Design a protein around this ligand. Structure first.
Ligand SMILES: [Mg+2]
Lengths: 1340, 69, 52, 552
C-alpha cells in the first residue's frame, strides 16, 4: 500500500485486475515542448533542426556566407511566480553563435576574414511550466494539440454526386508538410488531369514533359508493348496468353499448324492454358487488325528521312502499307484494354496542348501566375522551386514515410522533395486503382490523421521568423563591406520576438487555460483540435470527420466532446493513449501468444491494429488466463463479432481504456445513455471549487490520479519526516537513502496561498500533513482547491430525495434545504482583479492622489494618504477602491449654473473624477494591492510603503530559508563527525561555525566533510545573489504602455454562498437550477427525524435516460450508512477490535472483488485513524465498465441496516403526515457550475450609446440593452402590437432625439412617444446618396 | 416555390433586406422606382408604425387621405 | 474585427461620450424651472437685474 | 475619433477617399504640366480604379488598407452590412429598458404574473421611479431623486410598488419561434436575482429550468402598455395559434398529481361506502380514514348550461372515487361531472380545459387552470411518487427470448455454412429474427410492467393496472414513453454503423443492467449522430421559417 492511503481508502468493486496502471496524464504537453527546445545532435525536430533548415544563408553569388554555430537558452528574466504577478512573459533569452565568412574572390574557397560574432540575442521564447502550461501575461495558457491530415499521398474516390453519371472518379493528392499541393484527377472521359493547389486544370502528361519526357517515353512508362513482325509477308504478332483474357476473338487465332481459337469465340482460361503449354511465341494476324492499334515510338523512312508516324497515333491500313514498304519490320503498339489495363494516358496525350519541356514549362508558368509574360528562366525557376526545392518544399519524415508506405515501397525514410520516380509512381498507382487493383484510403481513419502539439507549432512559427529574417540577411549582404559589420547589425530582435509572441499571444489553439478546476485544466491539456491553421473550419467540414470513427477506439473518447458549433472537431485524448513515434495515435494492448493471454503490453497504432484480432476487456479468464468460453467477443478488421476460443492475437488492456480522464470520473457510466453522459462529462469540468473540499462519496478510482497528476496538489519530492508544517510552507527532512551525499538538504515546499485564477475563482493550497509525520516518496503533502487527500473532489455529496415537492422542483430545477446554505458548504470564493490606469493627456497628467473633488468623508476614510484602499478593508459596490482625477479645463456652464455657482459659492473644479469604483453589486475583501510605476516617474508614498514592506518580507522569507537549510546541513556534518571522530557531548559545546575547522581520520568520511563545507559556502553565497536580485526587481519600474504613468491593481475577494438561479448538476448530465431555499422546518424527513438536504424531480429521470444517477444515489445511501455505523462505534468508543472487524467486513462484500485489505496495519495508532476518517461515510470506487453490481450494492445496504429498496418512508415538514408510497433517498455527488446568477443577471434603463450608429452600448460594464432580433420582431408582428414595435426599434434604441424626448415624458408621468426617424435608416440614406444614387423622401 | 415567390415584392426597400443588396439598389435606381411602403418589412426598416394590427388603422386613414381630396 | 470573428468590428464598440446622457437633459429641463420659480419670488427689478 | 493610449481609429472610407482625392489632384497637375499620353492614361486608369474601390471594392484588384492585410471595407459593404442579409433593422438592435437573467419556478404564481428581481425592477423603471418620486414631493428635484434611489432610501420601494401595479412587462426566451415566444405578464417584486416564470407557460416558451435565461422588456408608451395587456398578455393567449387545442395544458408534475388522484385501486379505505358531498369526501381523506383512490358511490350536484343562456342543475348518486370526488370541487358550473370520472391522463386533462373554454368562456378557464396547477402540484407532492432502481422491471422470460433468437442466428449460420443460403439472404434473415426478438422482449416487458400488480378485495385475487411509479409517469403522460421505458427495461434496439447499415449484433443488455465496452461504443455513433442531427435541424427549421415569413 502507501502512506496517505492510510488516512483513507476507497472501496474498490469490480473484478478485472489492473494489468497496466494509468501513466502521467500531462504526458503529451510536456514531452512535446521538451522536444521543441532542447539541444539535438541531429536534424530531429527542434530549434536545432529549424536552424539547420534555412541555414546557412549566403549572399547572392556574393561569396559572403552567414552560417550557424550553436544556440543556448539563458536563465529566465523572472521566475514562474514573479512573472505571474508583474504580468510579463515567462521566457528565456535565445543566445545564438553566428559566423560571417567573407570568401576571397577567385576561388579555391577560402576566407579573407570570418568574424565569428558572439551569441546574438534574437527574441526571447516562452517556457513550459512543470504543469505543461505557458504564461503570456501573468496568465497560465495552454496550446491545444492539433490533429490534421498527415503529409503523404492520398487516394480518394468521390463517387455518387459527381456528374450524376455513376461512373464515379478517382483522385490522388500529394500533400506535403509545407509547400504546394499536387493533385491528380480523372474525369468522365477518363482523361487524367493534374493541378497544383486548387489551380487551373491541366492534362496530366504536361507535368512529365516538364520533367524532360517525350511522348515516346511517357508511352514507355504507362503502357506495355505489342510487337508486330512483318516476317516473310503479311504481318505476324508476338503473343502472351494472358493478353487475350477479357476479349472475344476478332479473327482466326491460329499458328503452329494448329487452330487454337476461331472467330466469335471468346478466349477463356481454356484457350489460354492450351496456348500456354503449347508454347506459342508467334501467331500470324490479318493486315486489318492494326486498324485500331496505337504505335508506341516514332518511325521514319531510312531513305526519305521523313516522319512516317508520330508516337501515339492510330495505325491504319494505309499508314501500315506506307511504313511496311519502307522496310520496317517491327512495330511497337500499346497494350490497351477498356477493362483490365486502361488506355488513359494515351487519351491524356491527345488532350495535351504542349510538345516539349519548354512548352510545358510555359503552359505551367502561365497557369501558376497567369497573364504576365512567361520567360525561360521564369518557367524554369518556378517549376524547380515548387516540388524540387529544398527550401520551399518538404514532406518531412512523416510525409516521406507515409508516402513510400502507401506506394508499397521499402525505405521508410528519404528526401523531403519529390523525385521523378515518386510522381510517376503515384500516377501509376492512381491508374492501377482505376484499373481495378488497389483500394482507396479514407480521411476519417486515424491512420491518415496525425497529431501535432505545442512543440511542433512553436517550431513552425520560429521557422517563419527565421525565413523572414533570412530575407533580411541576404538583403544586407548584397551591398555589404568587409569587416565593418558583424552578425549583429544584420539579425534583429523583433522578427523572432513578435513571430513566436504572435502564436502564443493569439491563436485559436492558444488559449487561457480553463482553470476553475483540476479536471478542467487536465482535460484542457489533453485535448485535440482539427481546427486552427492547417486544419479545417466549422463551416468547412461536414458530419463525416465529426463522427466517431471505429479507429477512435482506445485513442479518442467517444463520449466527451463539446456539443455545439464544433462537435467531433475537438473530442479528447483517451486515458491510455499515446502519440506515436511518427505522430499517429497508439493504444495499449495485451499480446496473446498460443492459448494464454499474456500480461505483456504492446503499443499499436491505427494502421498497426488493423488486421489483428483484439479480444475484450470484458471477458472471462481464470488462473493461467485461458478464455473460459469457446466463443469470445472480439473486434478484428473494422468490425466486431464472436471469435473462436483461440483465434486471438491480442486483448484489451483495461476496462476504461476507451474513454477519457473526464469520462472515467463518471460512476455507473455503463448505466448512462451516451447523450446525457456527454453532457455530464462536459459539465464536470465546469465545477467551481468549494470552500470545504469534501470528497466523492461515490468514486471510480481516477479521482486520485487526476488531482495528483495535475499541478493543483503539491507532491513530495522525497520521503522522510516533516520538520515543519505551516499553512504557508512545509518543510520535510529528507531520508538518507534518497538524499544526495553533498549539501545534505531538506526539501522545502512553499505553498501557494489565496490568489486569482484565470476564471476569477480562488486557488489556495492547504497542508494535509501534521508536524513530524512520516511521508512516502511521491505522496501528497498539501492539497489544492477542490482536492481531498490526493483524491479529486469537484463538489460535495449530500442527502437527496426523489419526489415532486409542491411544483417547486417542476422542470429540471432543484429544491434545496436551508441546511446547505447555513453550513456554507456549497459556498464559493471569488477573486476579481481590478485595475486603475493613470494616463497622460495633452490637457495634463492624471493623479492617483487621494484628493478628489465632490466626495464624502465616508468615501475618503477607506483610503490612505495616497488614495489607495487598505489591505483587508471590506467594500461593496460603489466604494472607491482607488482615487483618480483627470484635468478638464473650462467647465463652460450656462446662465442657470452661472447663477447657481454665484449664489452657493462653488468653484467648479478643473478636474473630473476618474477613480476606480467597486463594480455595482459586488462586495468583497481587499487581499492584495500592486503598484506599477513608469520607470523615471517618482514613486508615491503608498508605493514606497509597499516597496519597503516587500523588502522586509523578502528578507525574512529568504533568511528563514537560509537558516532552516543551514541548521539542516550542520546537523548532517555533526552526524558525520560522530562517525570516526566521536565526541557527542564534547562536540556541540564549541561554536557551530567552528565545526568546519575540524578534521577526521583518513577515510571517505573526511571527503564528505569536505563536501558538506564545500556546498555550505555555496548556499552561503547563493543567499547574497538571491537577496540582491530579489531586492532590485522590487525597485525597478516595470515597463508600461505609451501614455500610462502608473497602474494600481486591486485584488478583491468576494464570497458567494448560493442563491436561487444558480446552476448545479450531477456527473450524470442532469442539469438543474436552484429554485427555492426551503427552511429545515418544511423539509421532508424520515422516521429518525433527519431532514433531507435536496429534493429533486423523479420525472426528469425516465425521459433523459441516465439510470446511473439513481445508482449513485442508492450506493451512496448505503455508503453513508457504513459511515454512520462507524460513527456510532466511534462515538461509543468500542475498541480497536470491533472497529477492525466491521471495517474488515465492509472491505470484503460477498465474493470475488480485488481488494487487499488490513491486519497488516498497526492495531491501534493506524486503524483507529482510518475509521476516524471513515465516520463521514465510506468512500466507494466504481470503475467505469468494471463498476459495482445490484446484489453487491444491496448487500452493502444490508451491512448498513438500510433497506434493499433504497427507499425509506418520509414525512412532510409541514403536516408531519406520512407520504403515501416510499421515496428513493440517498447520497448524490453534486457539483456547482460557475454559471452563478450573480454574474448572469443584467439590466439597464438608459445607458451610454455608440458613436457610429446611435445604439445602446455598455461602457461602464453597465450592460447595453438586450438585442431585439428579426424573429423577436416577427413575434410583435404576429401579435399586431404596433406601438410596442415602433418604440422598440425607434424611441428605445435608434432614435437619437426619441430616447431623450421619451425620457422627459417618462418622468413627467406622460406615457407617449414622438418617434421620428431611426438613425440607422438616416445613416443608410447618407451612405446610399454618397454614391451616384439619389434617394429622396417625397410627398407629405 | 416559396423562395421564388418571395423574390417579387413591389417595395425595393424590402428587397434590399433579404435579396442581394447591390443588385436590387441598382436595378431599382435605373427605373426610378418609387417605394410607397404599404408593407411590413419596408415599414419596420424606416421605423414607422406597422401597417397592420394597432397601426392598421393609422396606415388605413393615411392611405385613404392619400390619393384623394 | 475583434474576437468572435463576427461583425463585432472594433468600431461598433466605440462609445459616444460627446452626446449628453438623457438623465442630464432631464435635470437641466428641471433647473430651468428651479431658477424660474426662484426668480419669480424676487422683486420686479431684482428679477430683471439678476436675469440681466 | 480618439482612443486610450493616444492612438486613433478611423473608417476605411478615409483611406479610400484619400486615395481618390490624391490621384485626382495628381491628374489635374499632370494636365497642367502637359504630360505625355501614356502618363495621363495611366493616371486616369488609376483614378478609375480608386473611385471603384471606394464605391464597391472587389470588382477590381481588391485594395488593402494601410499597413493591414485585410481588404478595406468599401461603401457597398457599408450598405450591405453582413451576417447574411440584414441591414441593422433585421438581424438585431440593442434596446433600452430591458434586462435578463436565469429563470426559476414560482408555483405560487398566477398565470397572469411573474416574479421580477427587485434590483432589476429598480434599474428598469428608474426613469418612472424618478417621476413618481418627485411627483409626490418625496424628492426636491430629479437630481435628488437619482441620489435617493442611488442610496435606495426605504421609501423608494413603496414608490416603485406604485408604478409596478398596472404596468405589465414583456418576457422572452432565446429561440423565438411563434408569437408566444414573447408574452406579457404582471410584475411581482421578488428578492433575489432570478426571474420567476409561471410553469403552465413553460410549454410555449420551450423553457427547461436547466439554466435557460429570459429577457425582459418594458412597454414604455401608454399604447405599448395597452397593447401588451390586451394582446401579448399571457392570460389572453391560452390557445396555440397553430391549432385550437390549449397551450396552457398542465405539463408534468401536475398531470402526475391529477393522475394519482383520478386513479382508482381495488380495495382501500372507505371502499364501498357512501357520502353526500365532495366537501366531506375531502374530510375523509384528510383525516386518513379514507384512501384517495377507492370506489365510492357519492352524491354530486353537476350543472349543465343547456337551457338557453342558462345553467341547469341536477344531482345523482355517482360511482366514482374519493380522489375524483375531491377534484370535482374545482370544476366550475356548466361542465358535467363525466369529465372528472375518467383516469385523467395528459390528454383528457387538456380536453377538460378546452371544453371549459368553449363553454364557460375565458375567465372561468383561466382560474380553472390556475387551480388545476395548484392542486396538481399539491397532490403530486402528497403522492410521494419517486423513482427507484427496482421500479424498472425486466421481463423474467427475457434471457430465454435472447437465447432462442440466439439459436435462430446459429441456425441461419449453419445454413450459410453449408451454402444453403446466400450471404445477403442470410444477413437479412439474421437481422429479421433479431428485430423479432427485440419486439418479443419489448411487448413482454410492457405486459409485466403494466397490469402485473395482482391484489385482493374480499376474495383471493383480482388484478388491475399497476401502481408502479415509472409506469404512472409513462401512462399519465407526465414523462417517459413506452419506447423509452423499452430502453430502460427491455434490451435496447440494434445499432447501425456510420455507413447506415444495421449491425446484426443488437444490444442484448439494458440500462438497468450493465452495458459493456462494445455496446456503449456502438451506441456512441447513434448518440453523436442524434445530437448533430437535432442541432442542425434547428437551423434548418429556422431557415424554413424565414423563407416562409418572407413569402407571406
Ligand atoms: Mg434545455
Amino acid at each position: 500500500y502507501s502512506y496517505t492511503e492510510k488516512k483513507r481508502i476507497r472501496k474498490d468493486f469490480g473484478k478485472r485486475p489492473q494489468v497496466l496502471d494509468v501513466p502521467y496524464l500531462l504526458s503529451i504537453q510536456l514531452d512535446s515542448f521538451q522536444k521543441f527546445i532542447e539541444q539535438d545532435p541531429e536534424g530531429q525536430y527542434g530549434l536545432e533542426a529549424a536552424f539547420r533548415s534555412v541555414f546557412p544563408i549566403q549572399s547572392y553569388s556574393g561569396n559572403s556566407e552567414l552560417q550557424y554555430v550553436s544556440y543556448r537558452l539563458g536563465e529566465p528574466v523572472f521566475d514562474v511566480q514573479e512573472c505571474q504577478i508583474r504580468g510579463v512573459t515567462y521566457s528565456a533569452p535565445l543566445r545564438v553563435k553566428l559566423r560571417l565568412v567573407i570568401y576571397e574572390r577567385e576561388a579555391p574557397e577560402g576566407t579573407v576574414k570570418d568574424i565569428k560574432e558572439q551569441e546574438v540575442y534574437m527574441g526571447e521564447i516562452p517556457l513550459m511550466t512543470d504543469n505543461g502550461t505557458f504564461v503570456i501575461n501573468g496568465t497560465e495558457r495552454v496550446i491545444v494539440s492539433q490533429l490534421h491530415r498527415s503529409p503523404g499521398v492520398f487516394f480518394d474516390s468521390d463517387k455518387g454526386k459527381t456528374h450524376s453519371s455513376g461512373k464515379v472518379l478517382y483522385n490522388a493528392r500529394i500533400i506535403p508538410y509545407r509547400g504546394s499541393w499536387l493533385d491528380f484527377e480523372f474525369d468522365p472521359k477518363d482523361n487524367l488531369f493534374v493541378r497544383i493547389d486548387r489551380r487551373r486544370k491541366l492534362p496530366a502528361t504536361i507535368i512529365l514533359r516538364a520533367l524532360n519526357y517525350t511522348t515516346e517515353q511517357i508511352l514507355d512508362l504507362f503502357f506495355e508493348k505489342v510487337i508486330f513482325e512483318i516476317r516473310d509477308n503479311k504481318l505476324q504478332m508476338e503473343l502472351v496468353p494472358e493478353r487475350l483474357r477479357g476479349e472475344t476473338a476478332s479473327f482466326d487465332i491460329e499458328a503452329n499448324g494448329k487452330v487454337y481459337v476461331e472467330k466469335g469465340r471468346r478466349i477463356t482460361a481454356r484457350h489460354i492454358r492450351q496456348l500456354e503449354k503449347d508454347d506459342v511465341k508467334l501467331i500470324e494476324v490479318p493486315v486489318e487488325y492494326i486498324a485500331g492499334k496505337v504505335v508506341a515510338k516514332d518511325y521514319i523512312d531510312e531513305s526519305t528521312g521523313e516522319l512516317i508516324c508520330a508516337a501515339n497515333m492510330e495505325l491504319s491500313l494505309d499508314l501500315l502499307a506506307k511504313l511496311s514498304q519502307s522496310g520496317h519490320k517491327r512495330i511497337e503498339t500499346l497494350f490497351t484494354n477498356d477493362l483490365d489495363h486502361g488506355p488513359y494516358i494515351s487519351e491524356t496525350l491527345r488532350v495535351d496542348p504542349t510538345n516539349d519541356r519548354l512548352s510545358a514549362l510555359v503552359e505551367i508558368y502561365r497557369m501558376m501566375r497567369p497573364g504576365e509574360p512567361p520567360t525561360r528562366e521564369a518557367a524554369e525557376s518556378l517549376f524547380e522551386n515548387l516540388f524540387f526545392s529544398e527550401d520551399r518544399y518538404d514532406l518531412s519524415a512523416v510525409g516521406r514515410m507515409k508516402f513510400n508506405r502507401s506506394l508499397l515501397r521499402e525505405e521508410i525514410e528519404g528526401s523531403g522533395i519529390l523525385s521523378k520516380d515518386d510522381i510517376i509512381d503515384v500516377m501509376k498507382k492512381l491508374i492501377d486503382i482505376r484499373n481495378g487493383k488497389g483500394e482507396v484510403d479514407d480521411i476519417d481513419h486515424l491512420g491518415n490523421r496525425r497529431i501535432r502539439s505545442v512543440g511542433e507549432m512553436a517550431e513552425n512559427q520560429f521557422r517563419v521568423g527565421l525565413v523572414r529574417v533570412e530575407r533580411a540577411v541576404k538583403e544586407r549582404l548584397s551591398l555589404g563591406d568587409l569587416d565593418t559589420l558583424m552578425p549583429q547589425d544584420m539579425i534583429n530582435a523583433k522578427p523572432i520576438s513578435a513571430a513566436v509572441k504572435e502564436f502564443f499571444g493569439s491563436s485559436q489553439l492558444s488559449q487561457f487555460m480553463d482553470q476553475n478546476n483540476p479536471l478542467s485544466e487536465i482535460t484542457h491539456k489533453r485535448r485535440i483540435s482539427a481546427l486552427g491553421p492547417g486544419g479545417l473550419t466549422r463551416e468547412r467540414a461536414g458530419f463525416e470527420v465529426r463522427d466517431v470513427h471505429p479507429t477512435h477506439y482506445g485513442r479518442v473518447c467517444p463520449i466527451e466532446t463539446p456539443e455545439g458549433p464544433n462537435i467531433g472537431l475537438i473530442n479528447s485524448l483517451s486515458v491510455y493513449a499515446q502519440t506515436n513515434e511518427y505522430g499517429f495515435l497508439e493504444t495499449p494492448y495485451r499480446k496473446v501468444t498460443d492459448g494464454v493471454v499474456t500480461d505483456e503490453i504492446h503499443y499499436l497504432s491505427a494502421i498497426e491494429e488493423g488486421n489483428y484480432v483484439i479480444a475484450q476487456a470484458n471477458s472471462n479468464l481464470d488462473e493461467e488466463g485461458h478464455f473460459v468460453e469457446d466463443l469470445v467477443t472480439c473486434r478484428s478488421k473494422g468490425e466486431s463479432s464472436l471469435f473462436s476460443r483461440d483465434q486471438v492475437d491480442y486483448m484489451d488492456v483495461s476496462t476504461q481504456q476507451v474513454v477519457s480522464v473526464g469520462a472515467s470520473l463518471i460512476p455507473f457510466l455503463e448505466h448512462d445513455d451516451a447523450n446525457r453522459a456527454l453532457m455530464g462529462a462536459n459539465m464536470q469540468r465546469q465545477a467551481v471549487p468549494t470552500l470545504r473540499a469534501d470528497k466523492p462519496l461515490v468514486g471510480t478510482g481516477m479521482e486520485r490520479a487526476v488531482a495528483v497528476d495535475s499541478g493543483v496538489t503539491a507532491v513530495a519530492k522525497r520521503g522522510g519526516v516533516v520538520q515543519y508544517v505551516d499553512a504557508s510552507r512545509i518543510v520535510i527532512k529528507v531520508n538518507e537513502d534518497e538524499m544526495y551525499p553533498g549539501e545534505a538538504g531538506i526539501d522545502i515546499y512553499n505553498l501557494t496561498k489565496y490568489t486569482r485564477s484565470n476564471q476569477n475563482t480562488c486557488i489556495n493550497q492547504m497542508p494535509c500533513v501534521s508536524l513530524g509525520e512520516p511521508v512516502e516518496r511521491g505522496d501528497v503533502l498539501a492539497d489544492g482547491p477542490s482536492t481531498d487527500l490526493g483524491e479529486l473532489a469537484l463538489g460535495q455529496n449530500m442527502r437527496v430525495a426523489f419526489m415532486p415537492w409542491n411544483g417547486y422542483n417542476f422542470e429540471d430545477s432543484i429544491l434545496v434545504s436551508e441546511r446547505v446554505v447555513q453550513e456554507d458548504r456549497f459556498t464559493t470564493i471569488h477573486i476579481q482583479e481590478l485595475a486603475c490606469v493613470s494616463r497622460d493627456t495633452k490637457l495634463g497628467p492624471e493623479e492617483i492622489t487621494a484628493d478628489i473633488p465632490n466626495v464624502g468623508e465616508a468615501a475618503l476614510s477607506k483610503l490612505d494618504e495616497s488614495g489607495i484602499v487598505y489591505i483587508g478593508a471590506e467594500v461593496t459596490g460603489g466604494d472607491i477602491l482607488v482615487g483618480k482625477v483627470t484635468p478638464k479645463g473650462e467647465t463652460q456652464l450656462t446662465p442657470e449654473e452661472k447663477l447657481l455657482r454665484a449664489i452657493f459659492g462653488e468653484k467648479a473644479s478643473d478636474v473630473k473624477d476618474s477613480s476606480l469604483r467597486v463594480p455595482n453589486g459586488v462586495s468583497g475583501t481587499v487581499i492584495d494591492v500592486q503598484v506599477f510605476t513608469r520607470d523615471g516617474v517618482e514613486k508615491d508614498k503608498r508605493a514606497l510603503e509597499i516597496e519597503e514592506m516587500q523588502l522586509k518580507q523578502a528578507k525574512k522569507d529568504l533568511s528563514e530559508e537560509l537558516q532552516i537549510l543551514e541548521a539542516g546541513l550542520f546537523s548532517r556534518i555533526r552526524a558525520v563527525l560522530v562517525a570516526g571522530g566521536v565526541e557527542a557531548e564534547k562536540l556541540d559545546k564549541l561554536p557551530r561555525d567552528r565545526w568546519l575547522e575540524l578534521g577526521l581520520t583518513d577515510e571517505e568520511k573526511q571527503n564528505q566533510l569536505e563536501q558538506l563545507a564545500e556546498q555550505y559556502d555555496e548556499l552561503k553565497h547563493e543567499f547574497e545573489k538571491k537577496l540582491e536580485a530579489k531586492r532590485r526587481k522590487i525597485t525597478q519600474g516595470d515597463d508600461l504602455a505609451p501614455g500610462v504613468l502608473k497602474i494600481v491593481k486591486v485584488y478583491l475577494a468576494v464570497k458567494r454562498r448560493i442563491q436561487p438561479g444558480d446552476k448545479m448538476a450531477g456527473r450524470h448530465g442532469n442539469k438543474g437550477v436552484i429554485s427555492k431555499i426551503n427552511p429545515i422546518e418544511d423539509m421532508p424527513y424520515d422516521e429518525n427525524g433527519t431532514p433531507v438536504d435536496i429534493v429533486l424531480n423523479p420525472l426528469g429521470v425516465p425521459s433523459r435516460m441516465n439510470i446511473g444517477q439513481i445508482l449513485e444515489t442508492h450506493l451512496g445511501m448505503a455508503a453513508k450508512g457504513i459511515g454512520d455505523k462507524i460513527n456510532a462505534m466511534l462515538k461509543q468508543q468500542q475498541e480497536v477490535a470491533k472497529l477492525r472487524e466491521f471495517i474488515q467486513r465492509a472491505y470484503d462484500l460477498g465474493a470475488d472483488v480485488r481488494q487487499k485489505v488490513d491486519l497488516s496495519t498497526f492495531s491501534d495508532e493506524e486503524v483507529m485513524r482510518l475509521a476516524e476518517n471513515l465516520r463521514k461515510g465510506m468512500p466507494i470506487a466504481t470503475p467505469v465498465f468494471d463498476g459495482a453490481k445490484e446484489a453487491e450494492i444491496k448487500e452493502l445496504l444490508k451491512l448498513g441496516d438500510l433497506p434493499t429498496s433504497g427507499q425509506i418512508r418520509l414525512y412532510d415538514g409541514r403536516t408531519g403526515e406520512q407520504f403515501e408510497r416510499p421515496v428513493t433517498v440517498g447520497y448524490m455527488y453534486m457539483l456547482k457550475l460557475n454559471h452563478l446568477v450573480d454574474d448572469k443577471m443584467h439590466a439597464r434603463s438608459t445607458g451610454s450609446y455608440s458613436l457610429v450608429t446611435q445604439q445602446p452600448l455598455g461602457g461602464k460594464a453597465q450592460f447595453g440593452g438586450q438585442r431585439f432580433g428579426e424573429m423577436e420582431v416577427w413575434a410583435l408582428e404576429a401579435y399586431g402590437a404596433a406601438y410596442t414595435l415602433q418604440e422598440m426599434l425607434t424611441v428605445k434604441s435608434d432614435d437619437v432625439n426619441g430616447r431623450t424626448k421619451m425620457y422627459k415624458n417618462i418622468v413627467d408621468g406622460n406615457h407617449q412617444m414622438e418617434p421620428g426617424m431611426p438613425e440607422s435608416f438616416n445613416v443608410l440614406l447618407k451612405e446610399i446618396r454618397s454614391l451616384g444614387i439619389n434617394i429622396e423622401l417625397e410627398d407629405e | 416555390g416559396i423562395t421564388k415567390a418571395s423574390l417579387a415584392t413591389e417595395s425595393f426597400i424590402s428587397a434590399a433586406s433579404f435579396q442581394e443588396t447591390t443588385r436590387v439598389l441598382t436595378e431599382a435606381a435605373v427605373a426610378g422606382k418609387r417605394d410607397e411602403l404599404r408593407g411590413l418589412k419596408e415599414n419596420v426598416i424606416v421605423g414607422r408604425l406597422i401597417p397592420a394590427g394597432t397601426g392598421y388603422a393609422y396606415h388605413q386613414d393615411r392611405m385613404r387621405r392619400r390619393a384623394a381630396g | 474585427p475583434i474576437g468572435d470573428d463576427e461583425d463585432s468590428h472594433l468600431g461598433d464598440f466605440i462609445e459616444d461620450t460627446t452626446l449628453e446622457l438623457p438623465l442630464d437633459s432631464a435635470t437641466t429641463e428641471s433647473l430651468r424651472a428651479a431658477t424660474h420659480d426662484v426668480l419669480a419670488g424676487l422683486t420686479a427689478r431684482e428679477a430683471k437685474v439678476l436675469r440681466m | 475619433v480618439p482612443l486610450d493610449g493616444g492612438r486613433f481609429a478611423t473608417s476605411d472610407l478615409n483611406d479610400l477617399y484619400r486615395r481618390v482625392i490624391n490621384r485626382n489632384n495628381r491628374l489635374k497637375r499632370l494636365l497642367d504640366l502637359a504630360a505625355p499620353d501614356i502618363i495621363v492614361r495611366n493616371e486616369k486608369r488609376m483614378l478609375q480604379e480608386a473611385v471603384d474601390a471606394l464605391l464597391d471594392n472587389g470588382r477590381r484588384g481588391r485594395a488593402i488598407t494601410g499597413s493591414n492585410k485585410r481588404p478595406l471595407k468599401s461603401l457597398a459593404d457599408m450598405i450591405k452590412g453582413k451576417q447574411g442579409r440584414f441591414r441593422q433593422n433585421l438581424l438585431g438592435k440593442r434596446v433600452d429598458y430591458s434586462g435578463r437573467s436565469v429563470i426559476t419556478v414560482g408555483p405560487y404564481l398566477r398565470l397572469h404574473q411573474c416574479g421580477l428581481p427587485k434590483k432589476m425592477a429598480l434599474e428598469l423603471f428608474k426613469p418612472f421611479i424618478y417621476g413618481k418620486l418627485e411627483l409626490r414631493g418625496l424628492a426636491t428635484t430629479i437630481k435628488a431623486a437619482k441620489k435617493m434611489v442611488e442610496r435606495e432610501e426605504a421609501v423608494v420601494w413603496d414608490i416603485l410598488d406604485e408604478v409596478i401595479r398596472e404596468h405589465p412587462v414583456l418576457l422572452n426566451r432565446a429561440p423565438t419561434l411563434h408569437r408566444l415566444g414573447i408574452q406579457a405578464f404582471e410584475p411581482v417584486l421578488i428578492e433575489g436575482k432570478a426571474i420567476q416564470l409561471h410553469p403552465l407557460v413553460c410549454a410555449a416558451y420551450n423553457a427547461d429550468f436547466d439554466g435557460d435565461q429570459m429577457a425582459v422588456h418594458v412597454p414604455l408608451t401608454l399604447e405599448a402598455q395597452l397593447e401588451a395587456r390586451a394582446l401579448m398578455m399571457s392570460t389572453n393567449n391560452i390557445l396555440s395559434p397553430a391549432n385550437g387545442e390549449p397551450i396552457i395544458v398542465p405539463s408534468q408534475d401536475v398531470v402526475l398529481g391529477l393522475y394519482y388522484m383520478t386513479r382508482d385501486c381495488v380495495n382501500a379505505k372507505g371502499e364501498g361506502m357512501v357520502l353526500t358531498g365532495p366537501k366531506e369526501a375531502e374530510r375523509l381523506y384528510r383525516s386518513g380514514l379514507a384512501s384517495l383512490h377507492a370506489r365510492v358511490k357519492v352524491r354530486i350536484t353537476e350543472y349543465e348550461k343547456d337551457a338557453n343562456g342558462e345553467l341547469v342543475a341536477k344531482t345523482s348518486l355517482k360511482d366514482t372515487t374519493v380522489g375524483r370526488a375531491i377534484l370535482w370541487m374545482i370544476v366550475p358550473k356548466g361542465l358535467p361531472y363525466s369529465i372528472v370520472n375518467q383516469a385523467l391522463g395528459k390528454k383528457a386533462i387538456s380536453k377538460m380545459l378546452n371544453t371549459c373554454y368553449r363553454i364557460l368562456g375565458l375567465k372561468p378557464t383561466v382560474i380553472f387552470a390556475d387551480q388545476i396547477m395548484y392542486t396538481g402540484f399539491a397532490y403530486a407532492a402528497r403522492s410521494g411518487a419517486s423513482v427507484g432502481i427496482d421500479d424498472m422491471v425486466i421481463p423474467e422470460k427475457k434471457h430465454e427470448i435472447i437465447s432462442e433468437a440466439e439459436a435462430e442466428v446459429a441456425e441461419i449460420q449453419e445454413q450459410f455454412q453449408s451454402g444453403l443460403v446466400t450471404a445477403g439472404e442470410r444477413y437479412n434473415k439474421v437481422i429479421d429474427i433479431w428485430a423479432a426478438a427485440n419486439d418479443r422482449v419489448s411487448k413482454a416487458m410492457m405486459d409485466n410492467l403494466q397490469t402485473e400488480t395482482v391484489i385482493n378485495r374480499d376474495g383471493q385475487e383480482e388484478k388491475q393496472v399497476s401502481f408502479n411509479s415509472i409506469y404512472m409517469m409513462a401512462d399519465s403522460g407526465a414523462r417517459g414513453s413506452a419506447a423509452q421505458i423499452r430502453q430502460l427495461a427491455g434490451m435496447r434496439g440494434l445499432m447501425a454503423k456510420p455507413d447506415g447499415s444495421i449491425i446484426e449484433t443488437p444490444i442484448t443488455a439494458n440500462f438497468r443492467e450493465g452495458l459493456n465496452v462494445l455496446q456503449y461504443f456502438i451506441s456512441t455513433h447513434g448518440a453523436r449522430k442524434g445530437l448533430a442531427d437535432t442541432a442542425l435541424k434547428t437551423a434548418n427549421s429556422g431557415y424554413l421559417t424565414r423563407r416562409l415569413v418572407d413569402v407571406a
